[PDB]
Symmetry: D2
């Protein structure tokens, strides 16, 4: 136990009275609305979202990085920190690894994971930066590079990621690359995309029978004029071209200003290509902020589409849920804790939507009552449900408060050497 | 001839000397660059783009409409005005009709067109507004409306557009609808799209063997929260689902801020679904401004993708080019003239790109020289080519100047009723 | 009483038990948080926002207008419909008039208002469209038009709006114009702005000393290349140049994509030029949608700045609140009702913010707890407070439910055949 | 000379015949339009834009940095490379320094600049990153940080930048900070701005009589929710509050999507607060791409406002021009060369605008001819003018071509060891 059980117990007991009052009051309100609070809590306690290993350490911008104390030394330290998030929120049992950042003996990774009660989600390849000893640089691209030898090198890297994933329990590979151009004319749009498709076809051939291959689109950054996998349209073309094992991953902050993201989610689901999500929030670009910290309603609307899929009886729909955030001005552990909480919050609210009533309002084109039906769910403070879900599963009623009371950050700050070069 | 031939001749002779000097200088410059100016002019002379019948009348916004003098009374006046654009620019031989706005006897329409030297491009259906005597309102949608009878009415309307088109020589139907929602929850995104696909399938069944069905995406307006055919991704799904006769139409001002539109064009070409274009310019939303008046380089970049495809000869590839603009503060005829000119300008510059050099710089990842290779073409003032193309094909060296010298606007102002200012409405 | 009192009473009694349960539950929760629910309800009951006369009728786009049944046929019908919004929500006692759309005998307008329990907020001038008999067209502008006679005509129109307002109790003039250009070069940015400033100075000269002059910025539409009063920066320059009675009006949907609007609010307050607001919501452009229907948190953050101004001790700050929306696919009355409700919702939530705790986290740079402090207020379902506030002041526990139960729309549909 | 004169001469001679033909042809075309090409060349040769010391090295993103060969390490190597840009384009005689990146003995810096034929433009302070041994971190801000000692440290740093500038010939200090918040509530907008204004007032007090203080606004990045100096509105409030020595700096890529930037320029000019520019191009955010590589017309429209201000003799008009770009996938020197070229290109085209005709069309509300009047100027290929201006003043007819023929990159690659 990364966090002493007596601390979790003490903090839960300190807040037990208030939780009881709030949960029971909410339960009565929901009952009057025809909703069984117990049914909602039972589903919420089962909702999981993968934590990014790269989000456990402090992030930075192209301008600067301002590390905090106790920054993780490597993947093992990162797993230890992820274990804290899982213990307290009980919503993050799986971790997303990024290669080569987290490269290590697969057996050892698996051993540490099992010891901490953690599993592993989709693997993430990295051909948007150069590792030492590469025969070819990814400066001008990777899977879509004009040089065949460079593309082959990128393909082999992705295959290595699959090998590592197979050994640790992963069942998918997420491919996000920076491939694109910064100047008009620099790249032939079609040829670059064709090169990418050929390279991905090779990676696809290396997928086990029960694995999925996720391609992640992004409008811009690092490329500032054009990006090969720039949007969901191109992403759909990728998934459809590659095969049934290939699907699309939607990262919330990767869309053009004002884009209706929840519709994109609906479209991909309709055509069976919604592989998963990379949750985060943003206001300007790919800000990678704590989920729901900027636009909580949008997060709810995305989950409204996810829950509607279940309501429409979509078969074989098991999208992967993952947090993809960077924490530049907060304790990464605290931000991941509250972000996972916010994701469960939006999910819980989506479960509250009276879809029988909503369907009627949609049929009759009663736009006002239709939107009010979504709002009645969204306006509901489901914090008591999230807190109770944590209580019953060994978590903390107030995760961040318990984390702070444990003195964990100071502890690891004394065990981990800060970077000096 | 809408414009007296002696006026066209007089205004051309007045500018012939300067044109000769500019054309010969550009010719020498292009020769030093290994380019034969005659080959470029020959292609420019053959580049055509359709003009919208609804574009020759003054447009407006939801706040007001400020009509000018000599506004067209109906489709016959509109065709007469479009004839001026074609006579002077020689780049707009075909007109795009919108139903029911341009409803009229098909035989009479065909007759006026043939007499004016105009043909007809894609028909445009209208299920984004209610017409008098209409049984079902399109307030909450049309092809994707929840009410079966309303969807059926919309389908029948589109089939009627096909029938009118068949009678006048049209070979395509462009479908743009406002269908969408203004509030979260109002529409079920998936069910609405399913209804749309089913309705379009019925329209597709009524398409002649040599016809095309174009669906046009738009991010927003009139719907302000969600739109059924919101972007090119959804548009691709539509075209792929319907069949080989269904393709996507790209309207420049219908994309999210900062979208790389030229890439969308390339992607659609790659997958054989680029049906055509709706040219215009914009800075904020679907502004429908004169093509190239705001971002001329973007227009060139779009044409760079078109010419690349036209270069490696993607056989059969014949996208339907059309101007889709609204003119709220200028003489519509003058704006359409200069807009058509700007479209030919971008095309001409794209033709100047050294494709071999560009390919070399792309393969070598010489980003700077690759971009400079495009700029060397774009920086070239091709006006002499555009002017000479017009001069030798019956047009005017300086179209707007000749239009003004003819006094055409004052002429039609005296032949048509005066207009009154009003509220919103296109 | 547009809505029968027995209907209001009936529908309130039907929901009285549930409200009592929810209100008491919330009261207990707030007490544990050191907040007295009664103090919040008292303030919510006094928060008012003006309703736009041009918003009670169905709106439309440049593509089409789809009227519903019982459409108001003029300003008098519009006042009758506005009376319904006020009676049920008790949050919209004042109506904003637009001239010449609402031209009618000022004396009669006032008489109708008094009879309906409605007052009048800021007057709105219209030099973005042409009226019959107008000597000069506003096609190429109004207050900033290159033609002196056209500018003078626009100034005179604004002065006429002031005279109408003085007769009905209005104390402010809001000026929003479409002036701008659709093409580079069409206008000389500086000269057009100089003309605008000179014309506005003439309006200011004729502004009563008990009135305020509000200028409203807008990034684009109807002008699609440049707009004279395009943003808050230009707006500030205008207000500062004209004088102390001139201030800036912030319409939520009039900003560039991703703009931090709440910061603009804070800036104008700091420099004493925040005249008021035009509430609405949007996702793409100036969509004019129901307030809070798209981005409810943003609305809360705007109110967080308004409440902080009070907490900071800002003096002489009494911004004019107005709803500026168009309703194209809903019953205008229902939309205005729920929009007024949403505005009070955001206000109530802003009042729940623990200012002392927030200040502490801000000074200590505890970003996570600072943001969580705002969320603790925002996540609170204040509907019971809004409902009780309405019940206590003569309104309805569930406004739209009561509205539908009354059959008012069907009633006016029958009274206003089309 | 960084580039051998015989190479410059040789590469000019091999392109002289074509230039002669193009310049004479453009001269005739302009003559038919009532314009004296020599008059345009005279103005173009006097247009200068400062090159950023931090621009000659290869840039990167938060994801990675892919250095090229012969990367300049330190201000001395950087000045050597900036010297090449000036020698070949003759449009960048001054360099913008950034402290502490370019820290070096002032006397030595000035001596090096003088020897290379380079001057120094506005100094740039850096309180958006932490330097080793720093007592207080700028993680949560600098000039507007909540902690007094931190603000004091930031103020002192800026005063140090002024001292360095005074020693080398600079006459201005540009202040761009990342100060802001990533979460609603994290900062109190007003209090943060008050702190910023008070701190800047202290910096203002340290300005020599003939110095200017430039504040640079930016919508976002590094702050992703709010930024203290977020737009030109706040920037204007800053300048007006601080005093006559304080003006606003407009960086093209620092505005919200679809913003009409040229109007912002016009507004600042009208109120005498246009301190200067940071030229670059962009398509999505603050991309820092080569000027004019994405939207050349927008660049021309900005220059149209600059030339109009001059035409009407606007009082107090004298903006400082600077390039602020990052080069991630090109040779930095080549990009700066062509960027400086694009800036002079837009300027030259703006000079071609028939101001009398334009004024007439504006007064008569002839929108179509007004816009065509701008287009007639913009459509003109002024490359011959730019090239001839360079040829007559010691520069290269085709700068990048001469640069590549010189083998300069390979030369410094041999003199400067790469990481690998
Ligand atoms: O979102 C992404 C890049 O912006 C990808 O998912 C990356 O792999 C991830 O963020 C780590 O950099
Ligand atoms: O672009 C469109 C609507 O914005 C469609 O093409 C219309 O049919 C056309 O613009 C006429 O309104
Ligand atoms: O917002 C506005 C125009 O976009 C102004 O407030 C108008 O006067 C109002 O909306 C009525 O059109
Ligand atoms: O533009 C800026 C930051 O985005 C400032 O001018 C910086 O000081 C400059 O770019 C160096 O990073
Ligand atoms: Mn991601
Ligand atoms: Mn990302
Ligand atoms: Mn169109
Ligand atoms: Mn359109
Ligand atoms: Mn408004
Ligand atoms: Mn508005
Ligand atoms: Mn800058
Ligand atoms: Mn910058």
């Amino acid at each position: 136990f990364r966090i002493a059980q007596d601390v979790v117990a003490r903090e839960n007991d300190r807040r037990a009275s208030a939780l009881k009052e709030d949960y029971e009051a909410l339960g009565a309100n929901l009952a009057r609305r025809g909703v069984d609070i117990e049914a909602v809590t039972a589903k919420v306690e089962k909702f999981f979202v993968a934590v990014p290993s790269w989000g456990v350490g402090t992030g930075g911008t192209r301008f600067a990085r301002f590390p905090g104390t106790g920054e993780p030394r490597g993947i093992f330290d990162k797993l230890d920190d992820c274990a804290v998030i899982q213990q307290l929120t009980r919503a993050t049992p799986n971790v997303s690894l990024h290669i080569p950042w987290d490269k290590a003996d697969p057996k050892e990774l698996k051993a540490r994971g099992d010891a901490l009660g953690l599993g592993f989600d989709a693997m993430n390849s990295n051909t948007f930066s150069d590792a030492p000893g590469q025969a070819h640089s990814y400066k001008y691209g990777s899977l879509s590079h004009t040089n065949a030898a460079t593309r082959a090198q990128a393909v082999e890297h992705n295959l290595e990621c699959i090998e590592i994933g197979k050994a640790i329990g992963s069942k998918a590979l997420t491919v996000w690359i920076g491939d694109g151009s910064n100047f008009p004319g620099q790249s032939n749009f079609t040829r670059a995309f064709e090169r990418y498709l050929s390279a991905m076809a090779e990676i696809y051939k290396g997928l086990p029978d029960d694995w999925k291959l996720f391609s992640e689109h992004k409008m811009y950054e690092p490329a500032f004029y054009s990006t090969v996998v720039q949007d969901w349209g191109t992403n759909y073309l990728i998934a459809q071209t590659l095969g049934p094992k290939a699907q699309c991953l939607v990262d919330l902050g990767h869309h053009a200003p004002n884009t209706n993201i929840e519709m994109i989610v609906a479209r991909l689901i309709q055509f069976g290509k919604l592989g998963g999500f990379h949750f985060n929030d943003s206001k300007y670009g790919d800000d990678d902020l704590d989920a729901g910290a900027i636009e909580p309603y949008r997060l709810f609307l995305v989950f409204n589409e996810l829950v509607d899929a279940e309501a429409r009886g979509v078969k074989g729909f098991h999208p992967a849920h993952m947090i993809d955030q960077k924490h530049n001005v907060t304790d990464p552990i605290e931000s991941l804790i509250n972000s996972a909480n916010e994701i469960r919050r939006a999910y819980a609210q989506a479960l509250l939507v009276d879809r029988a009533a909503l369907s009627g309002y949609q049929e009759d084109n009663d736009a006002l009552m239709a939107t009010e039906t979504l709002k009645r769910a969204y306006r509901t403070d489901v914090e008591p449900i999230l807190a109770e879900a944590r209580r019953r599963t060994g978590g903390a009623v107030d995760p961040v408060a318990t984390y702070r009371a444990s003195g964990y950050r100071a502890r690891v700050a004394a065990e981990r050497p800060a970077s000096v070069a």
